[PDB]
Amino acid sequence: VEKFNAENYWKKKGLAMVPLKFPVGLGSRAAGQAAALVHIYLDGSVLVT
Amino acid sequence: MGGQEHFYMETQSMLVVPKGEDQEMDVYVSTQFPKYIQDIVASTLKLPA
């Protein structure tokens, strides 16, 4: 890219790299609370929500 | 001893509404045994319960 920028005047190239640390979490324990409901019918099939 | 008619004031009534996805079907029936309605309809449509 440095070779391109020195050879060209009206067109330039660029390069960059950034790191990432993304913390994951809510405010309290009660905010990460989840629930579900599962049924099993007599034919063997399952309904989940 | 002679027979008898139930003569419920609400005659046999039902509405059957397909959802349009995965052949989902909701039946709204005047019945006593919703599980039986679920079975005979699922068996007829060759669908899991």
From Swiss-Prot, chain B:
Q: In which tissues is it expressed?
A: Abundant in liver, expressed in adipose tissue and at lower levels in lung, skeletal muscle, pancreas. In contrast to mice, no significant gender difference in AOX1 expression level (at protein level).
Which branch of life, at top level?
A: Eukaryota
Describe how expression is induced or repressed: In liver, is down-regulated by adiponectin and by the PPARA agonist, fenofibric acid.
Q: Where in the cell is it found?
A: Cytoplasm
Q: What else is known?
A: AOX genes evolved from a xanthine oxidoreductase ancestral precursor via a series of gene duplication and suppression/deletion events. Different animal species contain a different complement of AOX genes encoding an equivalent number of AOX isoenzymes. In mammals, the two extremes are represented by certain rodents such as mice and rats, which are endowed with 4 AOX genes, and by humans, whose genome is characterized by a single active gene.
State the family it belongs to.
Belongs to the xanthine dehydrogenase family.
- Functional summary from the UniProt entry: Oxidase with broad substrate specificity, oxidizing aromatic azaheterocycles, such as N1-methylnicotinamide, N-methylphthalazinium and phthalazine, as well as aldehydes, such as benzaldehyde, retinal, pyridoxal, and vanillin. Plays a key role in the metabolism of xenobiotics and drugs containing aromatic azaheterocyclic substituents. Participates in the bioactivation of prodrugs such as famciclovir, catalyzing the oxidation step from 6-deoxypenciclovir to penciclovir, which is a potent antiviral agent. Is probably involved in the regulation of reactive oxygen species homeostasis.
Q: How does it assemble?
A: Homodimer.
Descriptive protein name: Aldehyde oxidase
Q: What is the source species?
A: Homo sapiens (Human)
Q: Which residues of the full protein are shown?
A: 745 to 793 of 1338
